[model samples]
Target: EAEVHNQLEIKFRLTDGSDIGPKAFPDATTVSALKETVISEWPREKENGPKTVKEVKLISAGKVLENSKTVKDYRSPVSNLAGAVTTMHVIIQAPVTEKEK
Candidate 1:
């Protein structure tokens, strides 16, 4: 029996052109888990940071990644080349301000 544990290297790109990581994680990692990591590791100096996992959207290969999916689901043959780094765009959705009725 051959069991392969794939490791993926990902970098989160912020709107301000800053990056959070080039960290390596197992392919089985869920997108939601990755969002949580981003939330906790988010730069403190950055303004309007994500308050929750839902507010943090991850986009890769021109498509928004679903929280329920695993990292392996988003991998592409060309992009998942051995030791190649994958970039995930991070978008923080600001909470809407309430208006007086």
Candidate 2:
């Protein structure tokens, strides 16, 4: 942590595989926050929906996150949500044109 800190402790992560764990993050953060980060990383996701879509939904253990109740308003104590939450998708493709002889 940096010198400018207080009751809040922060950590970072990327949205890729499903191996993510809510328990990993402290109580200050939430699924909504994760969605925001993912969306920021992939803004043009909706445009490529069918082809490549990345979605971020917050589920408390096994409950779906309501649109009206944002992660900020309603998230697991282990992880709380905040308003202005957004979702995102990530994609990567590799070509097959080896130049090796």
Candidate 3:
């Protein structure tokens, strides 16, 4: 059995608005891996979050993230729960780039 001596709590938010609790996971967990756990927990709302998730947008840091080519980046835990927020809309940033296309 693994002894629980040192552990860290992490919090992550969904695209819709729902947030993940820190105490629910171990300190060695990655934000991405934690996201997977969160998604599985909500099979019904897993689509959006507090509402529904759409492939049309990407999210991060409690807001939608924008990436052109696309980047599989991961955020390390910070002193606060705010660090865990990931992308909810990576694609949305693309279309917005052009003033008028």
Q: Quick one: best TM-score, which candidate?
A: 1
The 10-residue segment with the lowest total lDDT in model 2: 82-91
Q: State TM-scores per candidate.
A: 0.75, 0.29, 0.33
Better of 2 and 3 by lDDT: 3
The alpha-carbon RMSD values of the candidates against the true structure, listed in the order shown, are 5.3, 11.1, 9.4
TM-score-best of 2 and 3:
3
lDDT of 3 by residue, 1-101 (tens): 35753443444444346554544344455545544444454354332222112223335555443333222333454464523433232222223223221
The C-alpha stretches of model 1 lying farther than 4 A from their native spots are: 1-6, 44-47, 77-82, 98-101
lDDT of each: 0.72, 0.36, 0.39
| True-vs-predicted CA distance for residue 94, candidate 3, Å | 14
Task: Looking at model 1, report the run of 10 residues with the lowest lDDT sum.
Answer: 92-101
Question: Of the pair 1 and 2, which is ahead by lDDT?
Answer: 1
lDDT of 1 by residue, 1-101 (tens): 22663466888997768887687766777988887888777754545666555667888877888888988788755455447678888776666752111
On a 0 to 100 scale, what is the lDDT of residue 47 in model 3? 28
